[PDB]
Amino acid sequence: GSSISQEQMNEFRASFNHFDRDHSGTLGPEEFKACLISLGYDIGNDPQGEAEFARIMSIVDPNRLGVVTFQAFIDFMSRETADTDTADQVMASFKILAGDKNYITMDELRRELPPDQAEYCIARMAPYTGPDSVPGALDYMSFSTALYGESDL
Ligand SMILES: [Ca+2]
């Protein structure tokens, strides 16, 4: 319950060189939008989202150099704490995280996600618990599409 972590921004600042088309240490407009694909951005390759992407490109330029910097990228990363349609792509990572197992532990989500994104994921994930279960197991693939408790009202 504190949004992005200091550690999340510290490992995610490395994404500054991950998708960097020219490796300038900064993602430009067409470059930033490509980096963001792997994060599950709120924009897409459509004419409306490219305008909104440019709206963000203006706020992730705090140095007025026209390029996205490490301290700028975090601005989007803290938004990650809200739902998206692209979010299906990023949630696919839970299968890689699990590897072979049919459930993920809360601890495994809390390995790749130090921040609130871990608790967000844990909450919507299917509650696999009981004595036959290990403490803090969740079904990553059979997760609740109805969120943590937004049913049977
Ligand atoms: Ca660049």
Side-chain angles (χ1 to χ4, degrees):
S2 58
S3 307
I4 224 207
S5 174
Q6 284 262 233
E7 291 174 299
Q8 187 66 81
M9 64 160 47
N10 139 86
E11 60 207 313
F12 181 63
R13 76 100 187 170
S15 200
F16 89 122
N17 97 115
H18 181 197
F19 260 87
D20 204 340
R21 238 134 166 83
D22 55 40
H23 213 88
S24 57
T26 36
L27 274 298
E30 188 208 302
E31 322 183 59
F32 173 54
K33 62 93 66 110
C35 185
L36 275 178
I37 303 177
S38 298
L39 283 302
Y41 56 0
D42 69 311
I43 51 252
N45 202 101
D46 91 286
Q48 306 175 117
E50 289 276 64
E52 299 298 311
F53 135 69
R55 182 173 56 76
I56 301 147
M57 216 269 133
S58 187
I59 74 173
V60 301
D61 181 23
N63 278 216
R64 300 288 148 222
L65 18 71
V67 236
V68 183
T69 89
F70 28 87
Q71 77 222 298
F73 287 104
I74 311 316
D75 201 15
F76 204 116
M77 224 298 110
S78 181
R79 316 300 174 91
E80 187 104 358
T81 60
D83 295 85
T84 346
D85 69 308
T86 44
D88 181 69
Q89 311 174 125
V90 60
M91 285 181 72
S93 64
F94 306 147
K95 177 63 225 154
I96 290 89
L97 226 197
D100 73 314
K101 50 201 287 182
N102 70 297
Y103 74 90
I104 202 85
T105 59
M106 299 184 179
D107 195 28
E108 279 154 325
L109 295 168
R110 290 170 62 84
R111 187 72 78 261
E112 71 172 4
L113 324 166
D116 279 23
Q117 282 95 316
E119 51 186 64
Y120 131 65
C121 292
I122 284 165
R124 282 102 170 283
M125 217 156 275
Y128 277 17
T129 55
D132 306 279
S133 304
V134 277
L138 306 153
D139 203 315
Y140 57 85
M141 57 184 177
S142 193
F143 82 101
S144 181
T145 57
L147 263 63
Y148 26 90
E150 280 60 41
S151 296
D152 297 343
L153 192 164

